[PDB]
Ligand binder design. Structure first.
Ligand SMILES: Cc1cc2nc3c(=O)[nH]c(=O)nc-3n(C[C@H](O)[C@H](O)[C@H](O)COP(=O)(O)O)c2cc1C
Ligand SMILES: Cc1cc2nc3c(=O)[nH]c(=O)nc-3n(C[C@H](O)[C@H](O)[C@H](O)COP(=O)(O)O)c2cc1C
Ligand SMILES: [Cl-]
Ligand SMILES: [Cl-]
Lengths: 226, 226
């Protein structure tokens, strides 16, 4: 009896601490076969995945964490977040960041703690599987919708196996080093990553709540005309 | 007892013919509340939705389909699809297009049938609910990942209610006309639409299959270092 679609949606959260329980290769393959059944414009299936486990996962994570801790600034190819920050987006970002820091006992402005927490991103938060997503250079903006559809399918499918995830744009910061480490072909662009693994159930960062906007704040229902 | 997550993922298909059964506002709201639980970078939740039913849905479909049938060309404000078409993308697009046409009995050279079939997009394929998605002008690329995540959550949640969908970039063709008809504020951009409804299980266009790439075509598994 697998979990139901609604249970998958509601139980999915961003998990940032994992146990050392390994994920079988067969489970990873089945998750990705399910995700490949995401829709995409004219069935182009633009998603490309790199799966890191074992020694190479540890090497990549440790090398990228050291770039952060060494003070090497990120350099992204694309703009992910707003260039002009304003409300209500300001407050949404501020709340989840403050709630994460509170769970970890980090005071705002403690730069040493903030940096060490940031660096954990690049270890995929200690997950036993690290996923990186790339797309071909000829792809346009539609393919980013497609990629989000594919990634959410991974995240929901994972719940079917009792697995957890964290989507991670952090990796975009070090696309040049990732390209070097993994010999990523020049015609592919690294878009983002995702941690996959079994949650550390009692880690405090896995036990806070996130809000969402009430639907009438972002949905306009229309029926009448004129 | 809702369907399981895997059944939702695999049974989802792009449905292009619907019954005349309406969808309750309660069910639309439930679907959107579930979709709101998609993840987004820093919980920005950039998605905005316009839900069309009843008279206004009929009117939008009428106006936009008549633009197609009258010869009025689309003008998109973004590039959704590649500007340079190459293999393997070319074959993927051609195969789904040829299989749709085959299901419909549309032969090479049937220009009026092809125009008719294209125009059906703009009626949301006859669905009782039409969705349009917008995002704020300050949002950047990342928000397209987020919107994709949200949209696929709709599509999968819908299966839990016995409903079906078709994601549709087609509406981007007539963003100017949609903005005027629905008074979409100037700081929001129309990204794409989606049909929602009960599939017509007898319609031939709902009774073909789409391919997906085998996972070795696009997943690279790496474990060893070096
Ligand atoms: C972002 C996006 C835009 C799409 N645009 C259209 C569209 O305008 N009209 C249409 O009939 N199908 C559209 N499709 C549906 C795809 O053709 C379909 O997802 C693909 O061929 C795979 O088939 P499946 O969804 O049945 O698995 C779109 C799908 C996506 C994800
Ligand atoms: C595209 C995308 C990129 C994200 N990037 C990161 C990241 O780099 N690091 C991180 O800890 N969380 C990241 N997040 C997770 C979000 O912060 C999280 O989804 C949001 O706060 C809502 O919380 P939830 O996923 O627990 O519901 C990302 C999420 C998305 C969708
Ligand atoms: Cl950014
Ligand atoms: Cl386009």
């Amino acid at each position: 009896a697998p979990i139901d679609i609604f249970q998958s949606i509601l139980s999915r959260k961003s998990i940032r601490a994992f146990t050392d329980q390994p994920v079988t290769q067969e489970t990873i393959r089945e998750i990705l076969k399910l995700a490949a059944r995401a829709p995409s414009g004219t069935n182009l299936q633009p998603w490309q995945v790199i799966v890191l486990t074992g020694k190479i996962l540890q090497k990549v994570g440790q090398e990228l964490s050291q770039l952060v801790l060494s003070g090497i600034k990120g350099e992204r190819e694309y703009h992910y977040y707003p260039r002009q920050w304003r409300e209500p987006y300001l407050s949404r970002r501020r709340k989840v960041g403050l709630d994460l820091y509170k769970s970890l006992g980090i005071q705002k402005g403690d730069q040493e703690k903030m940096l060490h927490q940031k660096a954990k991103n690049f270890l995929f938060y200690g997950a036993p599987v690290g996923l990186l997503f790339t797309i071909d250079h000829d792809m346009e903006m539609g393919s980013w919708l497609d990629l989000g559809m594919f990634m959410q399918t991974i995240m929901l499918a994972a719940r079917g196996f009792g697995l957890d995830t964290c989507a991670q744009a952090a990796f975009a910061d070090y696309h040049k080093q990732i390209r070097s480490l993994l010999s990523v072909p020049s015609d592919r662009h690294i878009i983002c990553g995702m941690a996959l693994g079994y949650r550390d159930m009692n880690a405090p960062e896995n036990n806070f709540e996130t809000e969402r906007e009430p639907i009438d704040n972002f949905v306009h229902f229309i029926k009448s005309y004129p």
